[PDB]
Design an enzyme around this catalytic site. Structure first.
Site, mmCIF file in Angstrom:
data_model
loop_
_atom_site.group_PDB
_atom_site.id
_atom_site.type_symbol
_atom_site.label_atom_id
_atom_site.label_comp_id
_atom_site.label_asym_id
_atom_site.label_seq_id
_atom_site.Cartn_x
_atom_site.Cartn_y
_atom_site.Cartn_z
ATOM 1 N N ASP A 1 0.844 -1.191 0.000
ATOM 2 C CA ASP A 1 0.000 0.000 0.000
ATOM 3 C C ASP A 1 0.877 1.238 0.000
ATOM 4 O OD1 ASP A 1 -2.278 1.632 -0.014
ATOM 5 O OD2 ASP A 1 -3.246 0.544 1.645
ATOM 6 N N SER B 1 -19.721 -9.324 -1.112
ATOM 7 C CA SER B 1 -19.738 -8.236 -0.129
ATOM 8 C C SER B 1 -20.222 -8.648 1.282
ATOM 9 C CB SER B 1 -20.633 -7.107 -0.621
ATOM 10 O OG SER B 1 -21.835 -7.637 -1.161
ATOM 11 N N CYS B 2 -19.990 -7.793 2.265
ATOM 12 C CA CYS B 2 -20.427 -8.051 3.629
ATOM 13 C C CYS B 2 -21.930 -8.382 3.679
ATOM 14 C CB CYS B 2 -20.150 -6.807 4.477
ATOM 15 S SG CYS B 2 -20.706 -5.234 3.726
ATOM 16 N N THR B 3 -22.725 -7.642 2.909
ATOM 17 C CA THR B 3 -24.170 -7.846 2.865
ATOM 18 C C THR B 3 -24.542 -9.218 2.306
ATOM 19 O OG1 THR B 3 -24.488 -5.469 2.482
ATOM 20 C CG2 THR B 3 -26.358 -6.908 2.111
ATOM 21 N N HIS C 1 -27.240 -0.289 6.848
ATOM 22 C CA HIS C 1 -25.791 -0.379 6.861
ATOM 23 C C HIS C 1 -25.044 0.739 7.583
ATOM 24 C CE1 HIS C 1 -21.917 -1.731 5.257
ATOM 25 N NE2 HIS C 1 -22.539 -2.773 4.738
ATOM 26 N N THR D 1 -19.307 3.713 5.966
ATOM 27 C CA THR D 1 -18.064 3.124 5.458
ATOM 28 C C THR D 1 -17.144 4.232 4.939
ATOM 29 O OG1 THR D 1 -19.156 2.734 3.315
ATOM 30 C CG2 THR D 1 -18.975 0.854 4.819
ATOM 31 N N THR E 1 -27.663 -1.473 -3.511
ATOM 32 C CA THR E 1 -26.869 -2.604 -3.086
ATOM 33 C C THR E 1 -27.054 -3.703 -4.119
ATOM 34 O OG1 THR E 1 -26.266 -3.838 -1.063
ATOM 35 C CG2 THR E 1 -28.599 -3.927 -1.755
ATOM 36 N N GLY E 2 -26.010 -4.500 -4.335
ATOM 37 C CA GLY E 2 -26.111 -5.578 -5.306
ATOM 38 C C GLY E 2 -26.486 -6.850 -4.577
ATOM 39 N N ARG F 1 -28.136 3.835 4.686
ATOM 40 C CA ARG F 1 -26.880 4.040 5.403
ATOM 41 C C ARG F 1 -27.167 4.921 6.610
ATOM 42 N NH1 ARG F 1 -21.649 2.941 3.254
ATOM 43 N NH2 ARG F 1 -21.926 1.157 1.821
#
Lengths: 330, 330
Positions: free
Chosen positions: B33, B148-150, B176, B179, B208-209, B231
């Site tokens: 990074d 994703s987390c979802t 959510h 973020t 959201t997907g 959110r």
């Protein structure tokens, strides 16, 4: 002008007061709560959420002179000792959240006033009237309830949707802003454990009677919808997330149009409509009790959709409380 | 042990690193990074959401020494010049959120690594694998995604519910937590206007997907689910609100029993189950990607219910990312 007296100068009590200021058909003449007169004046002048009071307010002789008009100030723990008749009070905005039954609220009439409008849902059989849902059903009752902020948001939307395509079944969630009932940090809440946790740190699953309450104001939907809430760390303005199953197939465009029509006609001022990229703060101060968010909702198909509607749980509800005071004075 | 290297030391990268510490089957040998080694160490030692690093960490010659083991620090903008072979890296945890395609992610195989695991949903056709949904469908692919987390929350739960009673259709909503892509105060977000608004002041309707992605990991549900997001102003821990219509009728007690069973068996570690009066902070640190909240959900009838499931969008996902690294290495 209808002479109004406010009991309980909490959030609702104070915003009902503020919104009443721009109406000619109504006039607040008295305020009762266990608060000094100068303290009431402070709580009125400044509002973390709604800004500085737009007008003049001063304390003179232990009473208030708001916008030049005198406001009788009292402090009776008991509603029967209120001498409303002395100040010539027609309707009483019962906003303490303590007297939500005929038995208790009747004491206002007993105390000299004509009718009582509870600023909360009935605890007994007192009728609930929600603008855009069933004001037309008012039968001259002298003690009425204006339901809660959430029901005032869901009721109008549910009527439109049900009336146009027919609601077979529906489940709702309201992402609700923090209230004075919650705690700054993990505190005591014997009747609701989750409700006691630090308000600003959590998404608190909560309950709400709105959905079922809607089955009472719009009987045709009795037993058809239910739901819950999610308290989130925001000071004001909430949103209803209504997931419904339709009888008549209806494209999303058809639903957007049915709602916009109501928002522009039969339900103008109650139901609002928007296609903008809005967020909660874009409704702080909103008078419409339900503002349809076109771009936010989603339809899986023509018989299963998710509708999103905003509402300033403070300003909207408060304005309607005054709409109900006028209505029962018609 | 599978030698791993992290690319992108954002929230996921650092929490994947932290959780990886407890695993004996895995070892982090390098981190890439655009950040100094001593800055990396600071981001590792202190976490506003997860506390101070449990263990030692120091900087010795532009390189990290965490809990003894030395970590190779670098700062390459192009994955191709990473020389993973030099440090013996088997799998690369792609967490920059910049290389979500085969052509870009492949740059890691080229550079010396055997396999790659995207810590976000694929932007091309790269396979998506979610523990508890389709880990068994893995076919040797060297480049995979962990969704994703979802989706890691919604997917396991929809599989239990679908497998037991069959999901006709469903629409979800996820409240959510904020973020890194959001703003502190109203800022610019060109592809998503709403998302640019001050995170701490609003409930921001977001897309959201997740739902449609669940259709990919669990094909049988393809085109059967969809949803959106809200959110809210919280630093961590989200929750999914799933409204479904079931084929086989099932009492809420039958649903709670089906989920609890999955959590104590086939999906132990992925799916959790609780009947406690929990709030979001009660899941900060939660490893299970989906924790069914029995008391929060509600059923209108035996074929229409609202299910609620929590998830630490950081710790849970991060853990499963490592689970997928161990899996594709098995």
């Amino acid at each position: 002008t209808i002479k109004v007296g406010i009991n309980g100068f909490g959030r609702i009590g104070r915003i009902v007061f503020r919104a009443a200021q721009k109406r000619s058909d109504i006039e607040i003449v008295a305020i009762n709560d266990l608060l000094d007169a100068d303290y009431m004046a402070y709580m009125l002048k400044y509002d973390s959420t709604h800004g500085r009071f737009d007008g003049t307010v001063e304390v003179k002789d232990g009473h208030l002179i708001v916008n030049g008009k005198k406001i009788r100030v009292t402090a009776e723990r008991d509603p029967a000792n209120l001498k409303w008749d002395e100040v010539g009070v027609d309707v009483v905005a019962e906003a303490t959240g303590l007297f939500l039954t005929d038995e208790t609220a009747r004491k206002h009439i007993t105390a000299g006033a004509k009718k009582v409008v509870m600023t909360g849902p009935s605890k007994d059989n007192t009728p609930m009237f929600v603008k855009g849902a069933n004001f037309d059903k008012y039968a001259g009752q002298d003690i009425v309830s204006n339901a809660s902020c959430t029901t005032n948001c869901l009721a109008p939307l549910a009527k439109v949707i049900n009336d146009n395509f027919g609601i077979i079944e529906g489940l709702m969630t309201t992402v609700h802003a923090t209230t004075a009932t919650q705690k700054t940090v993990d505190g005591p809440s014997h009747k609701d454990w989750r409700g006691g946790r630090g308000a600003s740190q959590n998404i608190i699953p909560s309950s709400t009677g709105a959905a079922k309450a809607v089955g009472k104001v719009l009987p045709e939907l009795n037993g058809k919808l239910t739901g819950m809430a999610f308290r989130v760390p925001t000071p004001n303005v909430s949103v209803v997330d209504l997931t419904v199953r339709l009888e008549k197939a209806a494209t999303y465009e058809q639903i957007k149009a049915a709602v916009k029509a109501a928002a522009e006609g039969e339900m103008k001022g109650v139901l609002g409509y928007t296609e903008d990229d809005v967020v909660s703060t874009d409704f702080n101060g909103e008078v419409c009790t339900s503002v349809f968010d076109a771009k936010a909702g989603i339809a899986l198909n023509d018989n299963f959709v998710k509708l999103v509607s905003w509402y300033d749980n403070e300003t909207g509800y408060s304005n309607k409380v005054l709409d109900l005071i006028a209505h029962i004075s018609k």
